[PDB]
Design a protein around this ligand. Structure first.
Ligand SMILES: C[C@]12CCC(=O)C[C@@H]1CC[C@@H]1[C@@H]2CC[C@]2(C)[C@@H](O)CC[C@@H]12
Length: 242
């Protein structure tokens, strides 16, 4: 109904295929290379989504790219959890229409423990009865949920932007106080999942040539330049709850 939800609903990216050959057997190299390629493809959509968000041009240009390059993992995981919930009721991880992870592929990817936590996130959309509007509002907040400890180039504009995206989530929610507690808690729970994936993908990139896993260009750069800033503690998530 407001101008805010109109925009989020209008800019929400469509379907993104991974390009996975489902005829080949489920090897560690094949699954991860297809996930990597899906990441490269989704990263193009996340950029164009982010730039079309209300007030996103208020940020400094370096801060615009920085906030995208830090928050992409959590954003994509959260959207994937939503796809998994809506399509297959959180039974499998719906990374893309041509890349759906069953229990076997959770195991063959050597990421079973991480896939379990992502499936658990997907089940929370069902357990908490999250609406599409709450999903979109929450997802938009995740873009503004990880920053350098030293701060951004223009920190005031980020703070003002983050404040307003919190306000919009509180609005579309509305002893209802428990709701906001729960949604903030669910948003916080994305961050530990994203950190495990940051560690996994970083380790995988280092050893990629040995295990024949293919990393595309933007993924290789971001995982080698931006992700280690997060893993070294220079860049950290903004939690709601301590
Ligand atoms: C973001 C992606 C791809 C987009 C998505 O739907 C969620 C998914 C979560 C796991 C990521 C994957 C991109 C490729 C990664 C980073 C692998 O290198 C290891 C974990 C994978």
């Amino acid at each position: 109904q407001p101008i805010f939800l109109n925009v989020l609903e209008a800019i929400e990216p469509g379907v993104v295929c991974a390009g996975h050959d489902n005829n080949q057997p489920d090897s560690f190299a094949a699954l991860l290379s297809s996930l990597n390629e899906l990441g490269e493809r989704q990263l193009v959509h996340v950029v164009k989504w982010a730039k079309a968000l209300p007030g996103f041009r208020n940020l400094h240009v370096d801060d615009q790219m920085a906030v995208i390059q830090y928050s992409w993992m959590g954003l994509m995981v959260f959207a994937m959890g939503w796809r998994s919930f809506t399509n297959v009721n959180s039974a499998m991880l719906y990374f893309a229409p041509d890349l759906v992870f069953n229990e076997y592929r959770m195991h063959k990817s050597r990421m079973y423990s991480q896939c379990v936590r992502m499936r658990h996130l997907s089940q929370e959309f069902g357990w908490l009865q999250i609406t599409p509007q709450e999903f979109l509002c929450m997802k938009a907040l995740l873009l503004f949920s990880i920053i350098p400890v030293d701060g951004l180039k223009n920190q005031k504009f980020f703070d003002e932007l983050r404040m307003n995206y919190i306000k919009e989530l509180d609005r579309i929610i509305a002893s209802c106080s428990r709701r906001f507690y729960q949604l903030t808690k669910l948003l916080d729970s994305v961050q530990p999942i994203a950190r495990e994936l940051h560690q996994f993908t970083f380790d995988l990139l280092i050893k990629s040539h040995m295990v024949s896993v293919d990393f595309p260009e933007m993924m290789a750069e971001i995982i080698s330049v931006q992700v280690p800033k997060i893993l070294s503690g220079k860049v950290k998530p903004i939690y709601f709850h301590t």
